[PDB]
Amino acid sequence: PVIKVRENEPFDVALRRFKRSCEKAGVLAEVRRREFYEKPTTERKRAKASAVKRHAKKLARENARRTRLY
Amino acid sequence: MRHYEIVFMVHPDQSEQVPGMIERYTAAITGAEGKIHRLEDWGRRQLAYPINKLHKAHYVLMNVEAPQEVIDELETTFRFNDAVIRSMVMRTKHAVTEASPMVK
Amino acid sequence: SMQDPIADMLTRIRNGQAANKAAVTMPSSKLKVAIANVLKEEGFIEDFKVEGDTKPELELTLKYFQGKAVVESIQRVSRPGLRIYKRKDELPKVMAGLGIAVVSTSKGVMTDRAARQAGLGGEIICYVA
Amino acid sequence: AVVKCKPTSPGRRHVVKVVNPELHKGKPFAPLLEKNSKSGGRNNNGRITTRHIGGGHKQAYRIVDFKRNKDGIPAVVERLEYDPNRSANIALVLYKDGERRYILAPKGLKAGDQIQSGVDAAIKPGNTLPMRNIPVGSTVHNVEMKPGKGGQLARSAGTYVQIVARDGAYVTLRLRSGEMRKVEADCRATLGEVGNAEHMLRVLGKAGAARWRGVRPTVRGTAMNPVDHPHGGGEGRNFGKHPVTPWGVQTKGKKTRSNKRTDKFIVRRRS
Amino acid sequence: SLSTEATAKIVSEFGRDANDTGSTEVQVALLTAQINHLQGHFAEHKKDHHSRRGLLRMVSQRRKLLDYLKRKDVARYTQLIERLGLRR
Amino acid sequence: KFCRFTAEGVQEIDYKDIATLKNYITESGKIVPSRITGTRAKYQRQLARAIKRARYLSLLPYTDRHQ
RNA sequence: CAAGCUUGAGUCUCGUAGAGGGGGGUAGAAUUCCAGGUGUAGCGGUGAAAUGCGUAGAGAUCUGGAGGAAUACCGGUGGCGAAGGCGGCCCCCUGGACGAAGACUGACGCUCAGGUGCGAAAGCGUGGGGAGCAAACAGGAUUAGAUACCCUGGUAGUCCACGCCGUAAACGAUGUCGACUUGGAGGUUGUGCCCUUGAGGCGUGGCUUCCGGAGCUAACGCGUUAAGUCGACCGCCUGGGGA
Ligand SMILES: [Mg+2]
Ligand SMILES: [Mg+2]
Ligand SMILES: [Mg+2]
Ligand SMILES: [Mg+2]
Ligand SMILES: [Mg+2]
Ligand SMILES: [Mg+2]
Ligand SMILES: [Mg+2]
Ligand SMILES: [Mg+2]
Ligand SMILES: [Mg+2]
Ligand SMILES: [Mg+2]
Ligand SMILES: [Mg+2]
Numbered sequence: 001p002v003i004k005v006r007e008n009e010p011f012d013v014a015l016r017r018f019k020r021s022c023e024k025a026g027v028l029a030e031v032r033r034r035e036f037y038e039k040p041t042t043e044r045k046r047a048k049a050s051a052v053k054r055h056a057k058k059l060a061r062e063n064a065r066r067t068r069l070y
Numbered sequence: 071m072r073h074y075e076i077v078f079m080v081h082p083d084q085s086e087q088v089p090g091m092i093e094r095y096t097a098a099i100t101g102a103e104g105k106i107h108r109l110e111d112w113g114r115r116q117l118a119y120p121i122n123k124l125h126k127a128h129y130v131l132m133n134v135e136a137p138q139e140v141i142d143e144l145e146t147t148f149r150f151n152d153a154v155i156r157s158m159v160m161r162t163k164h165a166v167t168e169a170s171p172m173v174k
Numbered sequence: 175s176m177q178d179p180i181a182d183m184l185t186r187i188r189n190g191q192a193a194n195k196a197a198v199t200m201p202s203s204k205l206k207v208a209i210a211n212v213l214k215e216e217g218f219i220e221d222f223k224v225e226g227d228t229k230p231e232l233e234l235t236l237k238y239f240q241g242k243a244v245v246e247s248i249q250r251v252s253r254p255g256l257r258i259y260k261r262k263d264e265l266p267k268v269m270a271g272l273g274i275a276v277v278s279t280s281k282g283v284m285t286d287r288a289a290r291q292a293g294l295g296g297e298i299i300c301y302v303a
Numbered sequence: 304a305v306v307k308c309k310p311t312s313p314g315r316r317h318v319v320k321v322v323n324p325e326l327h328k329g330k331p332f333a334p335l336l337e338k339n340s341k342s343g344g345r346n347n348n349g350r351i352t353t354r355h356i357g358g359g360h361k362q363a364y365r366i367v368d369f370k371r372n373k374d375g376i377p378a379v380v381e382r383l384e385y386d387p388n389r390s391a392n393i394a395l396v397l398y399k400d401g402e403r404r405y406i407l408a409p410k411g412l413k414a415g416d417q418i419q420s421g422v423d424a425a426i427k428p429g430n431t432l433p434m435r436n437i438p439v440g441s442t443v444h445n446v447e448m449k450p451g452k453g454g455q456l457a458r459s460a461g462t463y464v465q466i467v468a469r470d471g472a473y474v475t476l477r478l479r480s481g482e483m484r485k486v487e488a489d490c491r492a493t494l495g496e497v498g499n500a501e502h503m504l505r506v507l508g509k510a511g512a513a514r515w516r517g518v519r520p521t522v523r524g525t526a527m528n529p530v531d532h533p534h535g536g537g538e539g540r541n542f543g544k545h546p547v548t549p550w551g552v553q554t555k556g557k558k559t560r561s562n563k564r565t566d567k568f569i570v571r572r573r574s
Numbered sequence: 575s576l577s578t579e580a581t582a583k584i585v586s587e588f589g590r591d592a593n594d595t596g597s598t599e600v601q602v603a604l605l606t607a608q609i610n611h612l613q614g615h616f617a618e619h620k621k622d623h624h625s626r627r628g629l630l631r632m633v634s635q636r637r638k639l640l641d642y643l644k645r646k647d648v649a650r651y652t653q654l655i656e657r658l659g660l661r662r
Numbered sequence: 663k664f665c666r667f668t669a670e671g672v673q674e675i676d677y678k679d680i681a682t683l684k685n686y687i688t689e690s691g692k693i694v695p696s697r698i699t700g701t702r703a704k705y706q707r708q709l710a711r712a713i714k715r716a717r718y719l720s721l722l723p724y725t726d727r728h729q
Numbered sequence: 730c731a732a733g734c735u736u737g738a739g740u741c742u743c744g745u746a747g748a749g750g751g752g753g754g755u756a757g758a759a760u761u762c763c764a765g766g767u768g769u770a771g772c773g774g775u776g777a778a779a780u781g782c783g784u785a786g787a788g789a790u791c792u793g794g795a796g797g798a799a800u801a802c803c804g805g806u807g808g809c810g811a812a813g814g815c816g817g818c819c820c821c822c823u824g825g826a827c828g829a830a831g832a833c834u835g836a837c838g839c840u841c842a843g844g845u846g847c848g849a850a851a852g853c854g855u856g857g858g859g860a861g862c863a864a865a866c867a868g869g870a871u872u873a874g875a876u877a878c879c880c881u882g883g884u885a886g887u888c889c890a891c892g893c894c895g896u897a898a899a900c901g902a903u904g905u906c907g908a909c910u911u912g913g914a915g916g917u918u919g920u921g922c923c924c925u926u927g928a929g930g931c932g933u934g935g936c937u938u939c940c941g942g943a944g945c946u947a948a949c950g951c952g953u954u955a956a957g958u959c960g961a962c963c964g965c966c967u968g969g970g971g972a
Pocket of ligand 10: 905
């Protein structure tokens, strides 16, 4: 991403904008999974393990609204 | 027979033979009994990423209702032609004559 | 593939009794009507009726006595692939006379007790208790 | 197609015969045929310059056209014939005027096809036009070395040359050996590969099938005598020297190239 | 997948009222036409096993229809056989 | 949010449109996921194809950097 | 055995979704090499180092070119397929699946020993190719010892065509087909109707996901896609080792 800083802009805010752009692009987070070979078996296992937790959280959110006042 | 939505980008320098090649393609389609649909020229739009070390080509689009034989004939002509840079050919569900979003 | 209509009828009535249903509509047949007549005569069901011109449908009404279903166990005996033919001497007795062991023979399908009374055997159709 | 036969006899047990039902079952074209005299490895001085040559079967010569100078005139192909002077087949070609010639048969060719030559020919297997007009990346065969000389590159049963560059007046080509070479742009080439692409699949089966082709048995230096060969001699199967030719030249590894006149055309040595 | 015109022509040729469109003659005719069309397709793509299961299913259905027609009334079975050049 | 294609009754999506299609690609040339766009699975699979067609025809860059 | 019916089965007509299969092309990132221009004492790697790569210009960057694989985001308990399994894009052939309203043959239906075909990867033969990864193998490191887990190389193989085996925790450890049995919250796909002013509202089929009642089970758990009650068929089980 091009983060060419214009005039009258502090280096601090310029670097923060660059870091935010990198974070929203998610380039740094992709190397931690592209650094090694994940077998298709392992990838599918991770995907289902993440899907199971992803609606289990919503299931618990919608189920904890019945009892347990505080 | 089938409907296609052919489009191609040609070299910007030798962009004066585009009308001639368009006329030749239309003549071939008509001799092959193809009902030519809309035909537009988008000018020379700057390429998003350069192709063969040039940053701008000339866009030509045409919808053609022609048999697959002459369609393959046109594809081979595009492949063997030197002036044309790239060619996109895709089948269409039905004949379309509405104006393209580029010309709006 | 529906290869046994009698078993389908027994399954439907048994599931209706379990689910506390009121009426169990099904595609009827000559043998289904003959069996429903026996059920009405023996009091195990409440009512049976054939309503249909081109595709006759039997709509049996379930009978309940103080919550408990009247029919305790419904069992097919002579299923297609294993046919049972017993003479008059060896006609079955269900629940020591408290249940019916319906028998089909030449003189229609009346019941096991009526078959024994008339002195003719036949083939066992349904055990209803 | 390759056809294996039953082991009815030693010699038929281990032989397969690659056949072709499209080959002409008859006689060749007399006006285009000449006399092919076998030398047996002998030169004008009577010495044996090349060993393991002699005998075989009587063969004739077919005049095969490699220059392809007939520009602007199309032609059809009549049939295919087996050429005993090479590994591939020869296509008989009849021109519009009435000429008959023998051309190298491309892989994608059959009786009834039509081919032409010149600077306006179409890009299909069988035509011939200059490499300058031939697009980059093409796989051609029967490539020239000099303009109008004829044809010497990729003329075997299953050989083809691949064009990769058109830098100025010269073009770059990869040959079957894996070597890059520069040739003049005005040179001619025939599109596509060669016909008999499965020639290498054949096996002779017996020494008789080799004697039919006419290559004499090869004697081993280690089985020879010291006077006859450097490897000869010993009280048994012995060897105490590096493998060398009968004339002393090292065989395995020692390159024997000394031509420095055509070193400007060799882009990269074969590997 | 025969074309609409091809299916209509077969229906008109084989159905008595040109509106039958599903008897043990017109169905077998369509199956035979599809099998004959796919003969060259599979001879070209000899390794199209996924599309071959459909052809096998069509062959089985045609065999069942022919057996049923022969068991029911074998005069139209024989007539359909020589009309379509059926081997058996 | 909501599927604007269904809201406006857009039956088909064409790669030739760029002004109303750039809204579905990030600044890095990546496709905005459905969980952020608010688009149905019927039109996400057609938007992806249109974006791929535009990338092939040099209408939308694959990424910010190419050379 | 004969004569009838469509409710089982199947066909045609209009449409829909899909990484379904086969064949051929093309774009792009990236990795590795080849050559050149800047470029100076380090690079790589690990828990720690070393084998390894460097002043013969290593590592870094740029330019130009060569080659192989798959297609970042889309991407989801999303979709298809009998199973195995399929993911840039385009072109050609083609299988299968689902829906409103219809028309049509008329039990043509289910299962199936023996048989036939398909069938992950690994493996074998021939002909090609080979960028990266990587059995065997070498070296370095740890350990009392390490023929291994940590590292540097690295061949077969993984990539293509034609051939052979029918092997997997080939799993949903749940065979194929038909009917019935409380409910809730979704995903995907089609159609009908109402004023569609906004994915407004009511219905209606196919696939699929999570809870959950009766019931079942030794219990975990199944629970309308049942492991709840039955019907038709095939295959398999009879103590653990031996095997
Ligand atoms: Mg020898
Ligand atoms: Mg000597
Ligand atoms: Mg000795
Ligand atoms: Mg000796
Ligand atoms: Mg010795
Ligand atoms: Mg393999
Ligand atoms: Mg390793
Ligand atoms: Mg070691
Ligand atoms: Mg199993
Ligand atoms: Mg079956
Ligand atoms: Mg549950």
